[PDB]
Design an enzyme around this catalytic site. Structure first.
Site, PDB file in Angstrom:
ATOM      1  N   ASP A   1       4.950   1.963   7.592  1.00  0.00           N
ATOM      2  CA  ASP A   1       3.943   0.907   7.517  1.00  0.00           C
ATOM      3  C   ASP A   1       4.159  -0.042   6.338  1.00  0.00           C
ATOM      4  O   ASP A   1       3.231  -0.313   5.576  1.00  0.00           O
ATOM      5  CB  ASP A   1       2.544   1.525   7.439  1.00  0.00           C
ATOM      6  CG  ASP A   1       2.097   2.130   8.761  1.00  0.00           C
ATOM      7  OD1 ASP A   1       2.928   2.235   9.687  1.00  0.00           O
ATOM      8  OD2 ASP A   1       0.911   2.509   8.871  1.00  0.00           O
TER       9      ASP A   1
ATOM     10  N   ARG B   1       0.408   9.123   1.822  1.00  0.00           N
ATOM     11  CA  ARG B   1       0.024   9.135   3.254  1.00  0.00           C
ATOM     12  C   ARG B   1       0.884   8.154   4.047  1.00  0.00           C
ATOM     13  O   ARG B   1       0.965   8.336   5.210  1.00  0.00           O
ATOM     14  CB  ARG B   1      -1.473   8.932   3.465  1.00  0.00           C
ATOM     15  CG  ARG B   1      -1.967   7.524   3.187  1.00  0.00           C
ATOM     16  CD  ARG B   1      -1.951   6.572   4.349  1.00  0.00           C
ATOM     17  NE  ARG B   1      -2.006   7.251   5.619  1.00  0.00           N
ATOM     18  CZ  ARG B   1      -2.082   6.651   6.781  1.00  0.00           C
ATOM     19  NH1 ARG B   1      -1.282   5.646   7.067  1.00  0.00           N
ATOM     20  NH2 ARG B   1      -2.965   7.060   7.654  1.00  0.00           N
ATOM     21  N   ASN B   2       1.495   7.177   3.383  1.00  0.00           N
ATOM     22  CA  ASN B   2       2.418   6.180   3.959  1.00  0.00           C
ATOM     23  C   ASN B   2       3.880   6.628   3.849  1.00  0.00           C
ATOM     24  O   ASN B   2       4.731   5.807   4.086  1.00  0.00           O
ATOM     25  CB  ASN B   2       2.120   4.794   3.396  1.00  0.00           C
ATOM     26  CG  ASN B   2       0.880   4.199   4.009  1.00  0.00           C
ATOM     27  OD1 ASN B   2       0.596   4.443   5.159  1.00  0.00           O
ATOM     28  ND2 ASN B   2       0.129   3.444   3.237  1.00  0.00           N
TER      29      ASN B   2
ATOM     30  N   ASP C   1       0.829  -1.202   0.000  1.00  0.00           N
ATOM     31  CA  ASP C   1       0.000   0.000   0.000  1.00  0.00           C
ATOM     32  C   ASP C   1       0.866   1.255   0.000  1.00  0.00           C
ATOM     33  O   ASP C   1       0.719   2.128   0.857  1.00  0.00           O
ATOM     34  CB  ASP C   1      -0.957   0.014   1.196  1.00  0.00           C
ATOM     35  CG  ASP C   1      -2.057   1.057   1.051  1.00  0.00           C
ATOM     36  OD1 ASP C   1      -2.327   1.484  -0.095  1.00  0.00           O
ATOM     37  OD2 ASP C   1      -2.652   1.449   2.076  1.00  0.00           O
TER      38      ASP C   1
HETATM   39  C1  LIG Z   1       7.273  11.805  16.106  1.00  0.00           C
HETATM   40  C2  LIG Z   1       6.982  13.260  15.729  1.00  0.00           C
HETATM   41  C3  LIG Z   1       5.537  13.338  15.247  1.00  0.00           C
HETATM   42  O1  LIG Z   1       4.649  13.669  16.032  1.00  0.00           O
HETATM   43  N1  LIG Z   1       5.381  12.980  13.953  1.00  0.00           N
HETATM   44  C4  LIG Z   1       4.183  12.956  13.354  1.00  0.00           C
HETATM   45  C5  LIG Z   1       3.078  13.729  13.711  1.00  0.00           C
HETATM   46  C6  LIG Z   1       1.887  13.602  13.000  1.00  0.00           C
HETATM   47  N2  LIG Z   1       0.808  14.331  13.322  1.00  0.00           N
HETATM   48  C7  LIG Z   1      -0.539  13.807  13.029  1.00  0.00           C
HETATM   49  C8  LIG Z   1      -1.428  14.975  12.680  1.00  0.00           C
HETATM   50  C9  LIG Z   1      -1.620  15.877  13.903  1.00  0.00           C
HETATM   51  N3  LIG Z   1      -2.175  17.177  13.484  1.00  0.00           N
HETATM   52  C10 LIG Z   1      -2.509  17.994  14.661  1.00  0.00           C
HETATM   53  C11 LIG Z   1      -3.162  19.303  14.230  1.00  0.00           C
HETATM   54  O2  LIG Z   1      -4.362  19.025  13.479  1.00  0.00           O
HETATM   55  C12 LIG Z   1      -4.048  18.261  12.300  1.00  0.00           C
HETATM   56  C13 LIG Z   1      -3.406  16.944  12.711  1.00  0.00           C
HETATM   57  C14 LIG Z   1      -0.320  16.007  14.733  1.00  0.00           C
HETATM   58  C15 LIG Z   1       0.924  15.692  13.903  1.00  0.00           C
HETATM   59  C16 LIG Z   1       1.798  12.719  11.926  1.00  0.00           C
HETATM   60  C17 LIG Z   1       2.893  11.952  11.557  1.00  0.00           C
HETATM   61  F1  LIG Z   1       2.804  11.099  10.521  1.00  0.00           F
HETATM   62  C18 LIG Z   1       4.065  12.067  12.289  1.00  0.00           C
HETATM   63  N4  LIG Z   1       5.129  11.355  11.911  1.00  0.00           N
HETATM   64  C19 LIG Z   1       5.442  10.155  12.407  1.00  0.00           C
HETATM   65  N5  LIG Z   1       6.681   9.957  12.856  1.00  0.00           N
HETATM   66  N6  LIG Z   1       6.809   8.853  13.231  1.00  0.00           N
HETATM   67  C20 LIG Z   1       5.678   8.172  13.062  1.00  0.00           C
HETATM   68  C21 LIG Z   1       5.384   6.908  13.342  1.00  0.00           C
HETATM   69  C22 LIG Z   1       4.119   6.418  13.072  1.00  0.00           C
HETATM   70  C23 LIG Z   1       3.177   7.268  12.513  1.00  0.00           C
HETATM   71  O3  LIG Z   1       1.945   6.735  12.257  1.00  0.00           O
HETATM   72  C24 LIG Z   1       0.798   7.582  12.112  1.00  0.00           C
HETATM   73  C25 LIG Z   1      -0.443   6.757  12.473  1.00  0.00           C
HETATM   74  C26 LIG Z   1       0.635   8.115  10.819  1.00  0.00           C
HETATM   75  C27 LIG Z   1      -0.029   9.337  10.736  1.00  0.00           C
HETATM   76 CL1  LIG Z   1      -0.587  10.105  12.178  1.00  0.00          CL
HETATM   77  C28 LIG Z   1      -0.251   9.956   9.512  1.00  0.00           C
HETATM   78  N7  LIG Z   1       0.192   9.348   8.338  1.00  0.00           N
HETATM   79  C29 LIG Z   1       0.856   8.125   8.415  1.00  0.00           C
HETATM   80  C30 LIG Z   1       1.078   7.500   9.635  1.00  0.00           C
HETATM   81 CL2  LIG Z   1       1.916   5.972   9.581  1.00  0.00          CL
HETATM   82  C31 LIG Z   1       3.542   8.589  12.235  1.00  0.00           C
HETATM   83  C32 LIG Z   1       4.783   9.002  12.523  1.00  0.00           C
END
Ligand SMILES: CCC(=O)Nc1cc(N2CCC(N3CCOCC3)CC2)cc(F)c1Nc1n[nH]c2ccc(O[C@H](C)c3c(Cl)cncc3Cl)cc12
Length: 300
Positions: free
Chosen positions: A178, A164-165, A160
């Site tokens: 993933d 987004r991955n 996949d």
């Molecule tokens: C470690 C530093 C960190 O926080 N990184 C981070 C924040 C986020 N987010 C999620 C969105 C969220 N915002 C907050 C504000 O409103 C919009 C969403 C906060 C930041 C997403 C990411 F993919 C990441 N990047 C990831 N780094 N390491 C990961 C390990 C597994 C992981 O899995 C999550 C479920 C994921 C996510 Cl959340 C989105 N796309 C793919 C994946 Cl695989 C993401 C990260």
């Protein structure tokens, strides 16, 4: 509960869980602070991502996460993938500690950095200049390719591959995520739309969708779709085409059009990735080399 692997095991008390990042079919991801991930400096703080089971976890959910854990152990370290940092298996819930990419996935990265449209009152010398430039977009494509090339050499099929991955670090390094996931390929709801509106079926190679066959070349097809995503700056593939129409169009050999402001070189690579015969698609090694020439030519 599980056997102790001193190579990867990490003291859970050295973790401080913080904001939840996301949720999947199995397991959730929580941002956490880690102290002494580097054994050389025990009190040093670092930000990591902790993967764990939900409150709903069945014995299958555990098995999938345990399986993912073992895959991460075997695959080794590469610049362009999310690497395993450690695990927590003793006296407490199962944790899979992953690397952090501060900027989130590649799709949201691109979508949040689309150029200001024509409704912005000009302000400053760079009014029409957005965060994203062509060479950086090619770099993004190149890195994913080299990451997939590594995965392939480790005999790992993603199944996949999509924007987004792909995760983006603070220094805009692409990291594939993933890839070792049990995705239940024998019971896919092809009509299932994710919470953010994604139809994962639009990334499947024909042989995977129709014949349930997965090879590295089926990933190459997906990389073609991912290429389209990048140079549409986070666009959704097959615009306005419902899954039912996707089935028939694919059987008719339909392909996506060349997106606007996308040079013929890269749409050429896309169409090569979308050749019907898997053997007529470029390998990832060829993709790396082809994208390299483009990147070097635009990097004076
Ligand atoms: C470690 C530093 C960190 O926080 N990184 C981070 C924040 C986020 N987010 C999620 C969105 C969220 N915002 C907050 C504000 O409103 C919009 C969403 C906060 C930041 C997403 C990411 F993919 C990441 N990047 C990831 N780094 N390491 C990961 C390990 C597994 C992981 O899995 C999550 C479920 C994921 C996510 Cl959340 C989105 N796309 C793919 C994946 Cl695989 C993401 C990260």
């Amino acid at each position: 509960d599980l056997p102790l692997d001193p190579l990867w095991e990490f003291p859970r008390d050295r973790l401080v869980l913080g904001k939840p990042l996301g949720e999947g079919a199995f397991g959730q991801v929580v941002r956490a602070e880690a102290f002494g991930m580097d054994p050389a400096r025990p009190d040093q703080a670092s930000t990591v991502a902790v993967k764990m089971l939900k409150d709903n976890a069945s014995d299958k959910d555990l098995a999938d996460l345990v399986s993912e854990m073992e895959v991460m152990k075997l695959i080794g370290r590469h610049k362009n993938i999310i690497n395993l940092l450690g695990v927590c298996t003793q006296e407490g819930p199962l944790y899979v500690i992953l690397e952090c990419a501060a900027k989130g996935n590649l799709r949201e990265f691109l979508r949040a950095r689309r150029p200001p449209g024509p409704d912005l009152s000009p302000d400053g010398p760079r009014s029409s200049e957005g965060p994203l430039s062509f060479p950086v977009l090619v770099s993004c494509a190149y890195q994913v390719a080299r990451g997939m090339q590594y995965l392939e050499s480790r005999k790992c099929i993603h199944r996949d591959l999509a924007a987004r991955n792909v995760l983006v670090t603070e220094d805009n390094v692409m990291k594939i995520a993933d890839f070792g996931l049990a995705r239940g390929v024998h019971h896919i709801d092809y009509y299932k739309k994710t919470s953010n509106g994604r139809l994962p079926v639009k990334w499947m190679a024909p042989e995977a969708l129709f014949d349930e066959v997965y090879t590295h070349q089926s990933d190459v097809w997906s990389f073609g779709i991912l290429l389209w995503e990048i140079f549409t700056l986070g666009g959704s593939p097959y615009p306005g085409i419902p899954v039912e129409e996707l089935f028939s169009l694919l059987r008719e050999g339909h392909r996506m059009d060349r997106p606007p402001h996308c040079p013929p070189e890269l749409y050429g690579l896309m169409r090569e990735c979308w050749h019907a015969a898997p053997s007529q698609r470029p390998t990832f090694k060829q993709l790396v080399e082809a994208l390299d020439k483009v990147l070097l030519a635009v990097s004076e």
